[PDB]
């Protein structure tokens, strides 16, 4: 329509934000950023509909403007900034550090963690290229573009970063038999320990993946997210660890935790 | 009855953070008087059709309406 969009209704906003179909017929549009539109969590929906630390966007703007908040080691004083996958946020108040990861129910969880677990993150390499003047570089899944990494670091690998700079703490390559995390599809939030893969040269590299209950499935190689090696995750993981039990098994779980 | 309660760290904190309607219904402030929203829009359209300060147009309208 004659130019960029600026508005966003509810019911075009994604499902997993869990925004309610009442309460005004307009929704918070994620302004552009280092993450996409849909696999992103605005800070407004975060603060206003995950913690209830505020009730209204006016209050949230007060918060963002008084700068209790900071992402990537930076204040990021916008009410609708994309808090994407894996991302880190640090709050002086309560001295908390929340991390933005997924749950198996297909939602952005709220992973309470410490300042060092915030001070490092994870990032999937999106691609690698050679910039001008012969500077090899790569770019991640969070719009971060980084220069002079190891040549051993290639595509589909994952990096662990300092968060005071965009430099590397370490890296993990992609190969058969490594612990991963899923981003896309019915498997949103699974953790399923690569068992093998398949090429289909021409499009849609596919991967057969199963979690420790033997339970297997198949996913796209650009929807997966490698988090390190089998056993140790490089971070702390949320309730469930990407399992997707049955409706009845979860019913029994909660009925035990009545 | 059931509602929402909110205590602040102090009166000044409440005054700065809370809504003006809430403070004035508590009695902590004065509801600033305004005219009709339509009247605000009316004078806005007026001074949108006007350009500049206005003293020159005033003197010109004076010299013209003199006769």
């Amino acid at each position: 329509a004659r130019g960029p969009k600026k508005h966003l209704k509810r019911l075009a906003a994604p499902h997993h934000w869990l925004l309610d179909k009442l309460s005004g017929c307009y929704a918070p549009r994620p302004s552009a950023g280092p993450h996409k539109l849909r696999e992103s969590l605005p800070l407004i929906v975060f603060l206003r509909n995950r913690l209830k630390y505020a009730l209204n966007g006016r209050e949230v703007k007060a918060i963002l403007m008084q700068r209790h908040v900071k992402v990537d080691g930076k204040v990021r004083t916008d009410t609708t900034y994309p808090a994407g996958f894996m991302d880190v946020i640090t709050l002086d108040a309560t001295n908390e550090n929340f991390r933005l990861v997924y749950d198996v129910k297909g939602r952005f969880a709220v992973h309470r963690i410490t300042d060092e677990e915030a001070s490092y993150k994870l990032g999937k390499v999106k691609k690698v290229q050679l910039g001008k003047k012969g500077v090899p570089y790569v770019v991640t899944h969070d719009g971060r573009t980084i220069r002079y990494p190891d040549p051993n670091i290639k595509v589909n690998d994952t990096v662990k970063i300092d968060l005071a700079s965009g430099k590397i703490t370490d890296f993990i390559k992609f190969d058969a038999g490594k612990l991963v995390y899923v981003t896309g599809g019915r498997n949103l939030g699974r953790i399923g320990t690569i068992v093998h893969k398949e090429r289909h040269d021409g499009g849609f590299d596919l991967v057969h993946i199963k979690d420790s209950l033997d339970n297997t499935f198949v996913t796209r190689l650009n929807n997966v997210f490698v988090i390190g090696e089998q056993g140790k995750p490089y971070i702390s993981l949320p309730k469930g660890k990407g399992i997707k039990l049955s409706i009845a098994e979860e019913r029994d779980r909660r009925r035990a935790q009545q | 009855s059931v509602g929402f309660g909110l205590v602040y760290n102090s009166v000044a904190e409440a005054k700065k953070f809370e809504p003006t309607y809430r403070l004035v219904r508590y009695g902590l402030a004065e509801k600033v008087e305004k005219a009709s929203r339509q009247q605000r829009k009316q004078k806005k359209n007026r001074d949108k059709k006007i350009f500049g300060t206005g003293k020159r147009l005033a003197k010109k309208v004076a010299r013209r309406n003199a006769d």
Partner: protein
């Protein structure tokens, strides 16, 4: 633009209107359970028909069909929680068989009459709508309740109305003022 509020009925009219058998049976039911509306009767029959369709198209399925297991167990759970069904009949065939009479006896008005706070189901109706009642610690003025049996244990008259004290009555105060004036 505001997404429109869903609405959907809770009843269904008779396919064929004038069947004397149908009319007399449902009149018996209305005149015993203290009802005003074939609307209400159709409504309850419609709920029953929905659950019965579910029962049919579930027992169509094999055993250990996890859909059958989950949904049938939840159906059992709500039926025992509401009390139309027993605490020992979970085999789904009793569910095929259950009755509008069962729903009606689990309603509040005739329950009130069985408990004896009415002397007539119609007396229960007028007491309900005049708020001389509360099933828990909050007043209710709806006959159609489908009690959950915790209410049954917790029944009493309205605390904030006579027959549970706390006030003599509107016309009670009226009569008292009348006799005060007479003595005056």
């Amino acid at each position: 633009p505001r997404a429109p509020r869903t609405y959907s009925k809770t009843y269904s009219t008779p396919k064929r209107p004038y069947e004397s058998s149908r009319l007399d049976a449902e009149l018996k039911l209305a005149g015993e359970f203290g009802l005003k509306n074939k609307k209400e009767i159709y409504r309850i029959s419609f709920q029953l028909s929905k659950i019965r369709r579910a029962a049919r198209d579930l027992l169509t399925r094999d055993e250990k069909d996890p859909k059958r297991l989950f949904e049938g167990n939840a159906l059992i759970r709500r039926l025992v929680r509401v009390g139309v069904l027993s605490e020992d009949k979970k085999k789904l065939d009793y569910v095929l068989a259950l009755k509008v009479e069962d729903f009606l006896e689990r309603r509040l008005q005739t329950q009130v009459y069985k408990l004896g706070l009415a002397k007539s189901v119609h007396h229960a109706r007028v007491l309900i709508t005049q708020r001389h009642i509360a099933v828990g610690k909050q007043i209710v003025n709806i006959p159609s309740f489908m009690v959950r049996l915790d209410s049954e244990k917790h029944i009493d008259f309205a605390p904030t109305s006579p027959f549970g004290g706390a006030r003599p009555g509107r016309v009670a105060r009226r009569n008292a003022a009348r006799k005060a004036e007479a003595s005056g």
